[PDB]
Nucleic acid binder design. Structure first.
Ligand SMILES: [Zn+2]
Lengths: 49, 100, 75, 49, 961
DNA sequence: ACGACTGAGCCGATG
RNA sequence: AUCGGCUCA
């Protein structure tokens, strides 16, 4: 019912949290970086799980 | 107003006042995760008041006025198992804590 | 579109206007409802904009001509 | 407290909090741009500093 | 920092002027009104006075010829200096100090403000309407005042509230016995008195020891703000302003505080009071021709106080009914002499005995036709036929219409209210658990030494030991604290505790120290979520424990010790148990129970007790349960057995393990008790008790109020009301909820400083004690601010005429024409419970005003002018003749739509005030306690009301296009 | 005659 | 936060 009420269910490590996580990471990619970025491939995107 | 180190927050209690036994500090070897509290430290934020009718109201309760905010020494938000021992450096002019 | 988007790139033409034709389309299906055409296979509004390009549909020619339609329906 | 006419001062740069002063009559919000004097603050959000 | 030159008005006395300050010594302020020509003395701290100053863009109305505003509000250590534009001939830089303001308030007038500067948001005018909307709808609300309290919802408390709140002159003898909480239910009325109007200034008399409780609620039952009066504050209030203490309104003192000094009385009296509230736990008697010392003080109080309460004088204990005194108080008109009254009381024995109802008497002979009579022997007509009626399938019929011949007929009921544990039907029952533990060889080797060193005179010392072994060990033995691992009341702690942690429980022990040991023990050495409830600790601990003891299920267990009373902090959930120490005295034993035996205490109660055979405690367990069943049944007769078997029971306790010639007492005490139970079922005068609990009439009051706590638009609106003002809404894990006063945005005159704990649910709040939210709490400030400031959702902009929206762009420029119907009068004649200030919609384009769909459904389909200066209020130039062309015609449709709800407010006024008046003109005929000063208040109210109804006008405060 | 790697860790010490 | 110290890519 609020953002803060969810601030307790997250920290409590409630099970339903990780459920949503799987469908959020579903179709939402990531950037992965290594220094030195000498060129442009030093950063690439990889769809994580 | 001088800072203090006993269990006297107006916010967090009596939830995390059984990690701490009483009278000042974490009892030797108290299992504490990240976030929970150790030594109870608390600081005045000014406001210093002295108005007529409000002295009795705050007097009949326990005291709460020119003090204080959640200013305790906390477990770092990171892995911090438990305790081994507690050292104490009370200032020269006595005023000695009890658990000390 | 999770593995490789090679079919939907050369449909509009290039990879930069696979963004502003899909960003505009990923925007339209996130706000005021809007229709899911090619089966919403669970997925999210992210893939959908592109997925309409993988089955012979969404293009810049179809997003600047059909925005005149929502300016002929509110009179 | 940033002195009267010193390198730090509200009567020039604005108060030490949101819509407040130094001395302490004008508080919280109400007085949006109230050109005070006794403390000396054009009561605006401190970010003027 | 009250500085001289200020301009305070008044909170409850703004009929005088804009008051100029004229004196400060240390604790008071004197005002000056040049219009009315008079003063008003208040305090500095707790002072019903408000700050009046205006904002940038606004104006000040001066006192000669010119006036205007405004540049910059100029303080000088306290005194403001309105450097304000002059309208007479242009000038730029004109000085008009606040000390030179007007004494009257000719306002901004939201009509002509259109032609000024930048305006307020399309996102706050919608929460202005709402403010005046619910104000219009609540105050003509279905039930007067009884909306939010620190109670649970229960008939008999509210039946006394619903009744005497309607009484112009409250003159009630509150009688209800111990345990129930007679005072809390009894105030009921005191609170509901305020909000309707006709009372400030409630002097409450109470012996000084018992102020603490009385000060707190007061404030936490009905949030009764109290400044007490003692020699510590009398001496303050003396120099303050001098005279009588008009310093504050609500106050508590003792008649100890009245009597002691013999001019004090004269000062207490000439105070133009309203209500006199007095409570006492031990008596005030007077024998004829020889009256009482401390009593003769109040005589002169009462007579010149108009409204009066009294929480009994203390009969309840004994004598059954020798009440002429406590009735000589309320009305010396209908009690000439007592030598008579007795007669009234000698005669009413048969009727209530014979009342039996259809339960215990069923049918009765020609001693029922006779009398019943007396009262209706001469009235006659109807009941000839309806009196004999006893049976023949109409089981609820004649009963419910005959008990109003009676009840209504009692000559002492109308005043009196006596409830006990039978007429009322709300308690939960009592399931005792008996345990019997094995003794240790440590307590043996010891107590056989007690005899050798035992042998002194007196009575009490021999009795105390043996019987007590837990803290009969850390005094005389050697070591202080060692019994930890020893006795089986600690081994039990686990086996019982070790799996039954799920539910919460309530344990009561000996005293403090004994339970300070347990805490050390259990909390740790076993390992429980345990906390401390003793007697010594600061209030907040008692909140902290209770709070932690009441949480969803994370602070399972508390350790009650010593005594409590009958606390106003119900633990409505703690329905389980372990008895600990069986004291020695039924009364102190009946407080251990005192918490968990009450209506609120939902679910059935599990009493558990444990004892070691041979011990003193061994014997009492059976003496209480098997002698006079104090566990399974409430019993205040437990006392006057202990105080007749006294020396005949101590003999057997003293040396516990011996005389078998003993289970006679148990069954003599199960003799003297048992027959007294039915002795006091034939002492109950029922009808007063049926007049004082309700039934079908009281069943409703609760149930149709239980809907009106389930309000999901008060969880929203309220948060969405003060959030906007400048008080943010944080922490919602609990059913509320921490409100800190924000930088955005606030005026100094709030009570809340940092942290205001709260919630918006009756039965969830009751467990703890930390402030409430419901349409009567912290809103006397917040109501005012949504409306009485004016500039807050005053006039805003929105979707208008633009070509960007469709399908009629042209112009068709709409405008909100709200109008108030300010009923022109003050609250005492309660204009505010039939016609309060009220809104009305009015979006017109030349024609009459429109209303089709909701504003709530088009408030998220409006777009305000989100623009600073160069495109902000850019319709404010060439739109002055445009809109006001719909104002000459706009002020044509305000008399019809208003005078329709006016004539539909009078035909509720003269349809209920003149209807209610029959309930008092007619009950005079029954002639119970009533005197000629309640009717003529309504007959001087009716013709003050349809003189209140002819006067109302109008005032604008709305605009959104 | 000029010009001085890309990430963050931990400790320490005085405007 | 500037400087100093020292590790691993
Ligand atoms: Zn100032």
């Amino acid at each position: 019912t609020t953002i803060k009420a969810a601030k307790k269910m997250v920290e409590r490590e409630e099970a339903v949290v990780w459920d949503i996580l799987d469908e959020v990471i579903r179709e939402h990619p990531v950037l992965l970086n290594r220094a030195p970025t000498l060129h442009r491939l030093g950063i690439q995107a990889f769809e994580p799980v | 107003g001088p800072e203090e180190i006993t269990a006297d927050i107006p916010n967090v209690g009596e939830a995390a006042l059984s990690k701490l036994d009483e009278s000042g500090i974490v009892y030797i070897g108290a299992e504490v995760t990240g976030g929970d509290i150790l030594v109870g430290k608390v600081t005045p934020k000014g406001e210093t008041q002295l108005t007529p009718e409000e002295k009795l109201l705050r007097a009949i309760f326990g005291e709460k006025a020119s003090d204080v905010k959640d200013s305790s020494l906390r477990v770092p938000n990171g892995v911090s198992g438990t305790v081994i021992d507690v050292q104490v450096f009370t200032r020269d002019g006595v005023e000695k804590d009890k658990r000390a | 579109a999770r593995v490789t988007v090679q079919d939907a790139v050369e449909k509009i033409g290039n990879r930069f206007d696979l963004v502003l034709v899909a960003a505009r389309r990923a925007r339209q299906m996130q706000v005021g409802g809007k229709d899911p055409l090619v089966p919403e296979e669970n997925d999210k509004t992210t893939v959908i904009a592109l997925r309409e390009i993988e089955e012979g549909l969404i293009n810049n020619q179809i997003l600047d001509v059909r925005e005149r339609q929502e300016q002929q329906e509110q009179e | 407290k940033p002195e009267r006419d010193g390198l730090f001062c509200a009567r020039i740069f604005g108060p030490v909090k949101d819509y407040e002063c130094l001395c302490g009559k004008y508080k919280r919000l109400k007085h949006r741009g109230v050109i005070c004097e006794k403390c000396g603050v054009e009561v605006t959000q401190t970010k003027v500093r | 920092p009250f500085t001289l030159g200020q301009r305070w008005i008044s909170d409850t006395e703004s009929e005088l002027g804009l008051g100029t300050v004229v004196a400060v010594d240390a604790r008071t302020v004197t005002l000056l009104f040049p219009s009315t020509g008079e003063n008003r003395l208040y305090a500095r701290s707790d002072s019903p006075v408000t700050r009046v100053m205006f904002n940038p863009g606004d104006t000040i109305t001066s006192h000669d010829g010119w006036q205007m505003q405004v540049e910059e509000v100029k303080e000088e250590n306290g005194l403001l200096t309105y450097i304000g534009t002059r309208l007479d001939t242009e000038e730029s830089g004109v000085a008009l100090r606040e000390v030179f303001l007007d004494s009257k308030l000719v306002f901004s007038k939201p009509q002509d403000r259109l032609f000024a500067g930048q305006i307020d948001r399309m996102d706050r005018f919608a929460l202005r309407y709402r403010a005046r909307k619910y104000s219009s709808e609540q105050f003509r609300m279905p039930y007067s005042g009884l909306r939010g309290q620190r109670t649970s919802l229960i008939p008999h408390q509210l039946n006394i509230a619903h009744d005497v709140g309607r009484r112009h002159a409250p003159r009630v003898l509150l009688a209800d016995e111990v345990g129930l909480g007679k005072t809390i239910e009894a105030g009921m009325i005191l609170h509901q008195q305020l909000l309707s109007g006709a009372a400030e200034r409630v002097l409450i008399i109470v012996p000084e020891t018992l102020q603490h409780q009385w000060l707190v609620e007061m404030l936490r039952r009905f949030n009764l703000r109290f400044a007490l009066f003692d020699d510590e504050r009398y001496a303050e209030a003396q120099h303050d302003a001098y005279n009588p203490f008009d310093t504050e309104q609500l106050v508590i003192c003792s008649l100890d505080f009245a009597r002691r000094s013999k001019q004090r009385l004269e000062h207490l009296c000439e105070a133009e009071w309203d209500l006199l509230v007095v409570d006492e736990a031990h008596h005030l008697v007077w024998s004829e021709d020889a009256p009482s010392r401390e009593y003769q003080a109040i005589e002169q109080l009462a007579e010149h106080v108009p409204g009066v309460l009294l929480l009994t004088a203390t009969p309840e204990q004994l004598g059954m009914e020798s009440h002429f005194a406590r009735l000589r108080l309320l009305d010396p008109n209908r009690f000439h002499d007592f030598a008579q009254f007795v007669e009234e009381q000698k005669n009413y024995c048969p009727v209530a005995d014979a009342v039996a109802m259809l339960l215990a008497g069923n049918k009765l002979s020609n001693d029922e036709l006779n009398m019943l009579g007396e009262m209706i022997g001469e009235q006659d007509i109807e009941p000839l036929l309806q009196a004999a009626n006893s049976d023949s399938e109409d089981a609820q019929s004649a009963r419910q219409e005959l008990v109003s011949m009676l009840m209504d007929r009692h000559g002492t009921s109308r005043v009196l209210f006596r409830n006990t544990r039978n007429g009322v039907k709300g308690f939960p029952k009592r399931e005792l658990h008996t345990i019997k533990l094995p003794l240790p060889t440590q307590y043996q080797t010891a107590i056989k030494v007690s005899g050798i060193m035992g042998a002194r005179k007196s009575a009490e010392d021999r009795a105390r030991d043996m019987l007590y072994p837990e803290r009969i060990y850390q005094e005389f033995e050697g070591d202080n604290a060692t019994w930890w691992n020893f006795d089986p009341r600690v081994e039990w702690l686990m086996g019982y505790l070790t799996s039954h942690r799920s539910q919460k429980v309530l344990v009561i022990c000996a005293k403090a120290a004994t339970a300070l040991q347990l805490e050390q023990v259990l909390r740790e050495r076993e390992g429980i979520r345990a906390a401390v409830f003793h007697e010594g600790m600061s209030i907040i601990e008692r909140d902290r424990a209770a709070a932690w003891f009441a949480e969803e299920d994370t602070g399972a267990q508390v350790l009650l010790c010593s005594e409590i009373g009958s606390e106003g902090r119900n633990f409505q959930f703690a329905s389980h148990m372990v008895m600990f120490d069986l004291p020695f005295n039924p009364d102190l034993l009946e407080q251990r129970i005192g918490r968990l035996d009450r209506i609120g205490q939902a679910h059935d109660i599990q009493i558990h007790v444990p004892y070691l055979e041979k011990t003193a405690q061994s014997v009492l367990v059976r003496w209480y349960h098997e002698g006079l069943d104090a566990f399974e049944h409430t019993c205040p007769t437990g006392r006057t057995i202990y105080d007749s078997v006294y020396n005949d029971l101590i003999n057997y306790l003293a040396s516990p393990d011996q005389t078998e010639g003993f289970d006679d007492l148990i069954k003599n005490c199960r003799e003297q008790h048992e027959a007294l139970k039915a002795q006091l079922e034939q002492g109950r005068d029922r009808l007063l008790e049926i007049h004082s609990n309700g039934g079908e009439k009281a069943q409703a009051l609760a149930e149709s109020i239980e809907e009106q706590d389930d309000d999901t638009n008060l969880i929203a609106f309220a948060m969405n009301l003060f959030d906007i003002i400048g008080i943010n809404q944080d922490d919602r894990g609990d059913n509320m909820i921490v409100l800190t006063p924000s930088d955005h945005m606030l005026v100094p005159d709030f009570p809340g400083l940092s942290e205001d704990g709260i919630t918006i649910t009756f039965d969830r709040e009751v467990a703890l004690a930390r402030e409430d939210a419901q349409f009567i709490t912290w809103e006397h400030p917040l109501i005012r601010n949504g409306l009485d400031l004016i500039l807050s959702g005053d006039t805003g902009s929105s979707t208008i005429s633009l070509l960007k929206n469709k399908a009629l762009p042209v112009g068709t420029l709409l405008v909100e024409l709200i109008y108030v119907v300010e009923a022109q009068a003050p609250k005492q004649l309660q204009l505010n419970r039939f016609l309060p200030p009220t809104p009305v919609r009015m979006l017109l384009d030349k024609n009459g005003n429109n209303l089709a769909a909701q504003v709530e459904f088009e408030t998220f389909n409006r777009q305000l002018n989100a623009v600073n200066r160069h495109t902000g209020s850019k319709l404010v130039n060439a739109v002055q003749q445009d809109v006001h062309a719909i104002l000459q015609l706009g002020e044509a449709q305000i008399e019809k739509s208003a005078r329709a709800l006016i004539d539909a407010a009078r035909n509720e006024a003269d349809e209920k005030l003149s209807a209610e008046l029959s309930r008092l003109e007619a009950l005079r005929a029954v002639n119970p306690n009533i005197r000629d000063d309640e009717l003529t208040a309504i007959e001087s109210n009716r013709q003050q009301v349809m003189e209140s109804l002819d006067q109302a006008g109008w005032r604008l405060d709305a605009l959104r296009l």
